DNA sequence: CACAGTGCTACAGACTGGAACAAAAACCCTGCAG
DNA sequence: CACAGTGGTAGTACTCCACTGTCTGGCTGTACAAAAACCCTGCAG
């Protein structure tokens, strides 16, 4: 039987059928090799018909894959942290032994890639963007942006890589086309109609990172600290044709997750030195400023449609909020980024203030400090300008950061407990010896009951586990006085009562009663602090206690949320950055930022995360 | 446009084609429609096929797949550094789309390796070892080795784990059986005979490792530095019946590789202090010093054979 | 990477004196040529000549150390 | 003279196509053989 | 009131190893008509 001989062997057999199919291809199709054999064989198998093969023969060509489709292979490789070379190892293994290979080769995965990265879909900005090129196919650009490397100027030491802003925007926006059209159908809105009234709200974050080791390479020399600038799409809603203040279509269900945080720019720069950070990150701010005005026109769902963008920079820590706005940092006399009170007026009256600071007034105050029209002395001009000693570089929405606020308050209560173990308000001047002894007994008691090893620095998780009532009642037994016990216990209770207003995604729905009583509860909190703990809070408050006892109701009223705009998305993305610089990038100084950027853009797509569930 | 019409139009689109095919089958191959129509695709596609033509054509009734043996799946999982939960994610995704499931579930892998780990094969020493129990199924044993944790003594601040020496050795030797049999074959020495004089030379190594971060956990408090005792089978040779110092069979071609270094004991202990290190590592050195004397008996390649170390 | 010869060539350029520039290069040469005996897997096969010459080469290395670097290797080895 | 990778790029071998050839595998078929 | 994990164990839920008859859906030889959609041509502005 011919099924036992080689494929070369068969030469003599099928000559006449090849002649017949070549003659037949002319008169009806023109060269269609596939169909003339496909519809013949699939139907001739069903002549003596068992359906066992009818399933195998139906999906063989068109839908879907046969084997698993290349896009499914790409998703099951990116979303499980499989290195390319490990995947090729698995591919060879599953194919050579009993295959019938299922996965696709590497070079066809790499070909289904150029559709996901930016620089593939066409778009149009109306009107034309200001001092921004109109070419829509730019991929990964080097962040140096044309430095005249010549030796006599400032050196070009910094390596950097970045997409263009609008191109990554339109790609990460067209990726959500599935869910935007499904929201359009769910709300049952008109499709052909109401195409130009969309509105996008986008949270962007910035952050630095320490002790990133460096490599030998070939140069140039580079610092260890790395800086990562990334953005995330929070919500997309519709406006036309009337007032209809909000008609949401898509809202990110989990804004703090890794899976929704899109990297835009990576640098090997320190955060401290302003010169290099501003030189590299200048073009991004110019793109943002020129993009806030114009409207995007994108082909989605079969039709071209017009979008507008709204940016809210909220993912910055206080060090960077003060750097990017020129204020002095951070143990300064002026504690609040939003208000103008000094340390004294904020230890005196804790719970009454109003938000004033913004971008435009800070620019104008730098102008006043520089022109100095009244010939004032330095120390008093500083008070007249209220801490603006530098020109603001970038606009950030006036909001509080959740995670570092929780950490600040947890370190504050940890210091209070330490003071309490010993008697601090009887003997006001202790030594370092007794301080270390009190800290040691506090850590031993916390480890014995709460199951918490000591910490070098207060990370978020130790701050969630420390400020709970079990821990306080585990430290209440150490403090001998029976009145201080009740005091700090009611303090912890008030704090646990006011926490979910700021730490929740939407306090307006998940915890309305705690929202309604935040002002009064903070009043009682500050009253207990002023009364009983005055030995510690006479004239010195931390800047986070002020932010959380004065400005929280106004913040949650302005936008409607706090924790949903936290810096979690970037902080946690740093983990992905480290695991992608060690496992998935070329080991060289020249190329490796490009690989981390590409793989981290692929991990954070929605279209490749649709296949991880595959309808359960 | 030939994309989606039903049967009874392609019927008369290809009536003459199928009549000619049946005529050819009757003229030369008797008339077996299936064998003809299955082979029609081979040459028509192969004029220009990429590679997937051959795969989807060999996807015929033969093969076949139902999926790889669970051992191959286990090897893929332990050699691509895939976490168990990530592997289950891959399994669910590959079965839900177009499956036809290939990979095995987790619960059949968990019983698939019960042979590879120690404490499975039967073995016995002679003469019986000193100060070592004869149970041959001891798996992962806690290294503390019966410390009377009671408060007044020196406390047990150490979390450690270790395989017993003899059991991990007989499993690492029973695993290399393929290569020692193949060496006997290539060397053209008789397999059944002169099986009593083997000799196994084993390189052992001990090392510490700094700044292993501690966990919150329950207790007790533990230092951060860890110590990792491991060993590796360097070479195995034959001497019997004699006249040769040795006749080598298996020699590790890549001794320094990370693929050939078998861990034996893990501890959370500092290297500087001596009392904790020696109290944990007492038993290992004891049964090692007691093992150099006697000879091991294993059932390998079908027969009972004797080993020295 | 630093024990190779083309690396001693980048250092010999900073040393102003010439006799020392030759001395340290002769030292690097002797070392590159006695290293593979104890770094190789099986020196009895891959490099037999270096194994046969290790005694004389070590003698000469020690002689050069005592001669032109005595100020450092008087009593600390 | 650690060693298993770290991904992208480059070019080596595996394919067709008729022309035509040889060697071989093995049926069957004739010569010369008792 | 982050969040996606980390592997093992107990529990539920289901989907199957064998015996059995019965049932429907869909294959095959041409004949027979109803719809499909251009294209012709026919008669009219
Ligand atoms: Ca940081
Ligand atoms: Ca920082
Ligand atoms: Ca050490
Ligand atoms: Ca060491
Ligand atoms: Zn304020």
Curated annotation (Swiss-Prot), chain A:
GO CC terms of this entry: DNA recombinase complex; endodeoxyribonuclease complex; nucleus
GO biological process, alphabetically ordered: adaptive immune response; B cell differentiation; chromatin organization; protein-DNA complex assembly; somatic diversification of immune receptors via germline recombination within a single locus; T cell differentiation in thymus; V(D)J recombination
Tissue expression summary: In the adult, predominantly expressed in the thymus with lower levels in the pronephros, mesonephros and ovary.
Cofactor needs: Mg(2+); Mn(2+)
Cellular localisation: Nucleus
Catalytic activity: S-ubiquitinyl-[E2 ubiquitin-conjugating enzyme]-L-cysteine + [acceptor protein]-L-lysine = [E2 ubiquitin-conjugating enzyme]-L-cysteine + N(6)-ubiquitinyl-[acceptor protein]-L-lysine
Family affiliation: Belongs to the RAG1 family.
Function: Catalytic component of the RAG complex, a multiprotein complex that mediates the DNA cleavage phase during V(D)J recombination. V(D)J recombination assembles a diverse repertoire of immunoglobulin and T-cell receptor genes in developing B and T lymphocytes through rearrangement of different V (variable), in some cases D (diversity), and J (joining) gene segments. In the RAG complex, RAG1 mediates the DNA-binding to the conserved recombination signal sequences (RSS) and catalyzes the DNA cleavage activities by introducing a double-strand break between the RSS and the adjacent coding segment.
The protein, known as: V(D)J recombination-activating protein 1
């Amino acid at each position: 039987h011919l099924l036992s001989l080689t494929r070369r062997a068969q030469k003599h057999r099928l000559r006449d059928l090849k002649n017949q199919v070549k003659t037949f291809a002319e008169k009806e199709e023109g060269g269609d090799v596939k169909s003339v054999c496909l519809t013949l064989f699939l139907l001739a198998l069903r002549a003596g018909n068992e359906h066992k093969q009818a399933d195998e023969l139906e999906a063989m060509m068109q839908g879907r894959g046969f084997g698993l489709h290349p896009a499914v292979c790409l998703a099951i490789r990116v979303n499980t942290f499989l290195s390319c070379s490990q995947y090729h190892k698995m591919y060879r293994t599953v194919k050579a032994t009993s295959g019938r290979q299922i996965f696709q080769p590497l070079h066809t995965l790499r070909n289904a890639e150029k559709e996901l990265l930016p620089g593939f879909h066409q778009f149009e900005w109306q009107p034309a963007l200001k001092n921004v090129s109109t070419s829509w196919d730019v991929g990964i650009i080097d962040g140096l942006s044309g430095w005249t490397v010549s030796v006599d100027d400032v050196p070009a030491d910094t390596i950097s890589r970045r997409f263009r802003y609008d191109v990554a925007l339109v790609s990460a926006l067209k990726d959500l086309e599935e869910d935007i059209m499904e929201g359009l159908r769910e709300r049952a809105l008109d499709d052909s109609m109401c195409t130009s009234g969309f509105t996008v709200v986008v949270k962007e974050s910035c952050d630095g990172m320490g002790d990133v080791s460096e490599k030998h390479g070939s140069g140039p020399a580079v610092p260890e600290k790395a800086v990562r600038f990334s953005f995330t799409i929070m919500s997309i809603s519709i406006r036309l044709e009337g007032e209809d203040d909000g008609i949401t279509i898509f809202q990110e269900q989990k804004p703090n997750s890794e899976l929704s945080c899109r990297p835009l720019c990576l640098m090997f720069v320190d955060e401290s030195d302003h010169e290099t950070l501003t030189a590299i990150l200048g073009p991004v701010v110019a793109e943002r400023k020129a993009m806030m005005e114009s409207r995007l026109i994108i082909s989605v769902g079969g039709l071209l449609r017009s979008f507008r963008f709204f940016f809210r920079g909220t993912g910055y820590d206080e060090k960077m909020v003060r750097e990017m706005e020129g204020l002095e940092a951070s143990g300064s006399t002026y504690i609040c980024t939003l208000c103008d009170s000094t340390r004294a007026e904020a230890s005196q009256n804790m719970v009454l203030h109003s938000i004033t600071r913004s971008h435009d007034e800070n620019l104008e105050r730098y102008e006043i400090w520089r022109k100095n029209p009244f010939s004032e002395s330095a120390d008093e001009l500083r008070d007249r300008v209220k801490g603006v000693s530098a020109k603001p570089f970038m606009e950030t929405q006036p909001t509080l950061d959740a995670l570092h606020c929780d950490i600040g308050n947890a370190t504050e209560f940890y210091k209070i407990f330490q003071d309490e173990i010993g008697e601090v308000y009887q003997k006001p001047n202790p030594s370092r010896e007794e301080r270390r002894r009190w800290r040691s007994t506090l850590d031993k008691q916390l480890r014995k009951k709460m199951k918490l090893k000591p910490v070098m620095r207060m990370n978020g998780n130790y701050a969630r586990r420390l400020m709970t009532r079990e821990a306080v009642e585990a430290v209440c037994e150490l403090v001998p006085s029976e009145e201080r016990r009740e005091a700090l216990l009611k303090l912890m209770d008030l704090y646990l009562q006011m926490k979910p207003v700021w730490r929740s995604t939407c306090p307006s729905r998940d915890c309305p009663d705690q929202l309604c009583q935040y002002s009064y509860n903070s009043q009682q909190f500050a009253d207990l602090l002023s009364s009983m703990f005055k030995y510690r809070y006479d004239g010195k408050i931390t800047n986070y206690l002020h932010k959380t006892l004065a400005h929280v109701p106004e913040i949650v009223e302005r936008d409607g949320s706090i924790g949903a705009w936290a810096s979690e998305g970037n902080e946690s993305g740093n983990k992905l950055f480290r695991r992608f610089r060690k496992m998935n990038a070329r080991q060289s100084k020249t190329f490796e930022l490009e690989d981390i950027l590409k793989h981290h853009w692929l991990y954070t797509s929605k279209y490749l995360q649709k296949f991880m569930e595959a309808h359960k």
